[PDB]
């Protein structure tokens, strides 16, 4: 069941995996939810995405202290928008090692974000170059191609049936692809399909702006993106 913790919501998805949710009252649209992940790997915790703000991200760390009570070894953030990187300063204040796509770190300042400490780079096939993602444990990082943004990355969780599409993927009942302001409309569909192909055994797809869904999230997202081309 959902756990309200201050202004955030936490939901256990699997034995060692929780979803964090935070909200930003954005004038013109409404109060927009964004989801990320928290993963326990043995005696440490790994975070995927910040909350929208530093204050909210500090609350994620407070929840982790209360409910898990193990050190956060690292965080990976999945592109240079506020929902994913808005809380970088809070992570740094906590002494957490941070990672993002090299391109996300490059784009961060102009997007109003603080860059992560470390840059991930990717092979031609999309898989992270392993030397750039040291000690990632069960986190398997994949660049699916440009879509929601040029820099969007995705994360599978080994030992689970979960893959995280971030803002690239919307659920199977979504009416649109959300914020396309920085999108690559020509490549979106192929990138969504590449995410699915990278994590073919994932049965639970987690994403930024929908609740967890089946792989129908991937097929529906790609089919909607076929219209963008
Ligand atoms: O986003
Ligand atoms: Zn975004
Ligand atoms: Zn987003």
Strand order in the sheet with the most strands:
1-2-3-4-5-6-7-8
At CATH level 3, the topology is Metallo-beta-lactamase, Chain A
Element order, helices and strands? Answer: EEEEEHEHHEHEEEEHEH
Small ligands present: hydroxide ion, zinc ion
Main sheet overview: 8 strands, mixed
> Quaternary arrangement of the chains shown?
monomer
Strand content: 25-35%
Number of strands: 12
CATH superfamily: Ribonuclease Z/Hydroxyacylglutathione hydrolase-like
How far is the N terminus from the C terminus? Answer: 39 Å
**Molecular shape:** globular
CATH class: Alpha Beta
How many helical elements?
A: 6
Helix content: 10-25%
Structural classification: alpha/beta
PDB class: hydrolase
Keywords: NDM-1, metallo-beta-lactamase, conformational change, hydrolase
Assembly: monomeric
Entry title: Crystal structure of NDM-1 at pH7.5 (Bis-Tris) with 1 molecule per asymmetric unit
Please tell me about this protein's structure.
This protein is of the alpha/beta class. It has one domain: Ribonuclease Z/Hydroxyacylglutathione hydrolase-like (Metallo-beta-lactamase, Chain A, 4-Layer Sandwich). The protein has helices at residues 54-67, 82-85, 88-93, 102-107, 188-198, 216-226; strands spanning 3-5, 8-14, 17-26, 30-41, 44-48, 72-77, 97-101, 118-120, 139-142, 154-157, 162-164, 204-206. Strands 1-2-3-4-5-6-7-8 form an eight-stranded mixed sheet. Strands 9-10-11-12 form a four-stranded mixed sheet, with no helix packed on it. A hairpin with a 2-residue loop joins strand 2 (8-14) and strand 3. Helix 5 packs antiparallel against helix 6 (216-226). The longest helix has 14 residues, at 54-67. One zinc ion binds at residues 79, 81, 148-149, 167, 179. It is classed as hydrolase. The entry lists the keywords NDM-1, conformational change, hydrolase. The assembly is monomeric. Crystal structure of NDM-1 at pH7.5 (Bis-Tris) with 1 molecule per asymmetric unit.
């Amino acid at each position: 069941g959902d756990q309200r913790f201050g202004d955030l919501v936490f939901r256990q998805l699997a034995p060692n995996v929780w979803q964090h949710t935070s909200y930003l009252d954005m004038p013109g649209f409404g109060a927009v939810a964004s989801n990320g992940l928290i993963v326990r790997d043995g005696g440490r915790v790994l975070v995927v995405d910040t909350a929208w703000t530093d204050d909210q991200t500090a609350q994620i760390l407070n929840w982790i202290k209360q409910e898990i009570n193990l050190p956060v070894a690292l965080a990976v953030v999945t592109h240079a928008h506020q929902d994913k990187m808005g809380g970088m300063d809070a992570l740094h204040a906590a002494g957490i090692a941070t990672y993002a796509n090299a391109l996300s770190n490059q784009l961060a300042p102009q997007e109003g974000m603080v860059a992560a400490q470390h840059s991930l780079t990717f092979a031609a096939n999309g898989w992270v170059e392993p030397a750039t993602a040291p000690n990632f444990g069960p986190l398997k990082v994949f660049y699916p191609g440009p879509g929601h943004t040029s820099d969007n990355i995705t994360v599978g969780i080994d030992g689970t049936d979960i893959a995280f599409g971030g803002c690239l993927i919307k659920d199977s009942k979504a009416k649109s692809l959300g914020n396309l302001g920085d999108a690559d409309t020509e490549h979106y569909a192929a990138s969504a399909r590449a995410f699915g192909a990278a994590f073919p055994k994932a049965s639970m797809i987690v994403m930024s702006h929908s609740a967890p869904d089946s792989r129908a999230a991937i097929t529906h997202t790609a089919r909607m993106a076929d219209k963008l081309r």
